[PDB]
Design a protein around this ligand. Sequence first.
Ligand SMILES: O=c1ccn([C@@H]2O[C@H](COP(=O)(O)OP(=O)(O)Oc3ccccc3)[C@@H](O)[C@H]2O)c(=O)[nH]1
Ligand SMILES: O=c1ccn([C@@H]2O[C@H](COP(=O)(O)OP(=O)(O)Oc3ccccc3)[C@@H](O)[C@H]2O)c(=O)[nH]1
Ligand SMILES: C[S@@+](CC[C@H](N)C(=O)[O-])C[C@H]1O[C@@H](n2cnc3c(N)ncnc32)[C@H](O)[C@@H]1O
Ligand SMILES: C[S@@+](CC[C@H](N)C(=O)[O-])C[C@H]1O[C@@H](n2cnc3c(N)ncnc32)[C@H](O)[C@@H]1O
Lengths: 236, 236
Amino acid sequence: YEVDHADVYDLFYLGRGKDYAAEASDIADLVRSRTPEASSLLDVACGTGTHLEHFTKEFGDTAGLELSEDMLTHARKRLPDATLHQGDMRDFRLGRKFSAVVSMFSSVGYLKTTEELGAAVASFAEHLEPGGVVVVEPWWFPETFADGWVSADVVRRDGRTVARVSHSVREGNATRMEVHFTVADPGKGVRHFSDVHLITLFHQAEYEAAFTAAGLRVEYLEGGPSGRGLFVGVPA
Amino acid sequence: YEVDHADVYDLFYLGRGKDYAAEASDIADLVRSRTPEASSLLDVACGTGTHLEHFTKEFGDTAGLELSEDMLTHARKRLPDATLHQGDMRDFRLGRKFSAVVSMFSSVGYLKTTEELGAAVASFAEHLEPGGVVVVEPWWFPETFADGWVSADVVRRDGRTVARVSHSVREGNATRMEVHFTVADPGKGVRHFSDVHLITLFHQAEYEAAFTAAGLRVEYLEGGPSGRGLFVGVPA
Ligand SMILES: O=c1ccn([C@@H]2O[C@H](COP(=O)(O)OP(=O)(O)Oc3ccccc3)[C@@H](O)[C@H]2O)c(=O)[nH]1
Ligand SMILES: O=c1ccn([C@@H]2O[C@H](COP(=O)(O)OP(=O)(O)Oc3ccccc3)[C@@H](O)[C@H]2O)c(=O)[nH]1
Ligand SMILES: C[S@@+](CC[C@H](N)C(=O)[O-])C[C@H]1O[C@@H](n2cnc3c(N)ncnc32)[C@H](O)[C@@H]1O
Ligand SMILES: C[S@@+](CC[C@H](N)C(=O)[O-])C[C@H]1O[C@@H](n2cnc3c(N)ncnc32)[C@H](O)[C@@H]1O
């Protein structure tokens, strides 16, 4: 019995209560707060495009960047008319600029070293219009990481039930999170799958340094959509 | 990081709220309602011995029978002084009698035909003292089986998390249940495993014929510890 992973991740976070719409909206205001005339936005590592959908309604002129083809395929299925690009946040070149460049849900954490973070932040800066703003939702900091953390949840949405458990342990300067998904569709079957994610624990200062090197004045905001806060940058 | 499967089931059921003490307690009084001076009890397919430990304070002279050596190693670890037997409820011969012979938690559902169910029941009968009573907690009947059923729960006990998902579908005259367990211990690791169970859907009438053939006058009691009811039989 087969199941589509990304579709499974999508149903889970929706059922979990993650609210992409509300998230998208708060970010748009955040964006407007620094760039009132904001008129275009780029979602780096947009995944399946849930925030992109809403950002598209907010600013109209939007685009998405994703390293994963599979993420891309799902994004396209959700947004057949969206402008999407395959590429690495590390060094992409889109040949255009945007009022805002944002990266949500800790994607930059998948960057392996400060040199990569810096390069990815520089790239963000490079697609930024004058008076633009960069918003990055980071992964946890070495100082705020909760080692050995276990998450276990059950969601049931649209007739499907999904159980998910993750265990997180620090390894080096990264979080090694192993996730187990259990999926069941009544009268159809039950299926299990797991993923292992390595998310870098950059110190906040490392994050800020990446913004400074890219010529961006940056500020960290506590809280954020997931409790990891948010980094906001603008041309220095 | 490895996990002891039966200890997993155990912790699971405790966490879920299955009250083996209360159940044994209820069965103990059910027995007495039929055999007031009941003084010995055999627990057939005792599993890891949870009910047996309680029946032991209930009647003192007790014994357990299990076909599974694994189940027996855990019952023994739990009760170093319990009298335990390895063997088949279809045809074991203990060379002794008990005031009560009980089989809990749908164990007889693992028998595949009415012929086996009859041989098992005759065996219980053959181990019964005069004025004794047999109590069988059956599996669901074809008439009350809920096909496509999905069960999904998360329990947390002794700092260990266990997420369990089962999906049940009818197959011929049995339920095929595939059970998925996901277990984690913070800072220890996370593990997943799955089992598949084929439990016969015997009609109520079929359970009765078994008792009848065994020389016992039987009564079906609605509800029971698992909502599957209970069969109470005494020498006709
Ligand atoms: O104060 C905290 C609380 C949680 N965590 C970490 O947050 C994660 C929560 O596990 P999760 O599976 O519920 O998080 P998630 O659904 O957000 O998974 C991810 C992983 C990477 C990027 C986005 C979502 C774990 O790594 C845990 O160590 C911390 O580091 N600090
Ligand atoms: O009205 C009902 C309600 C439940 N069921 C069946 O009860 C079972 C409940 O799933 P479960 O995983 O919660 O059962 P369990 O934890 O009691 O697992 C077993 C399985 C065999 C023996 C003992 C416990 C499923 O097969 C479901 O079809 C029915 O047939 N009819
Ligand atoms: C936690 S998901 C976030 C997806 C989306 N932002 C969301 O909110 O759901 C991390 C995403 O980053 C993408 N990703 C990882 N490394 C990347 C890189 N170097 N360049 C671009 N995208 C990357 C992954 O493919 C994945 O879709
Ligand atoms: C659902 S478990 C319940 C066990 C226990 N009475 C309880 O309440 O936890 C069913 C048990 O039946 C045992 N079993 C299955 N077939 C058997 C047989 N033919 N003879 C004896 N035991 C059997 C299995 O080893 C398993 O431990």
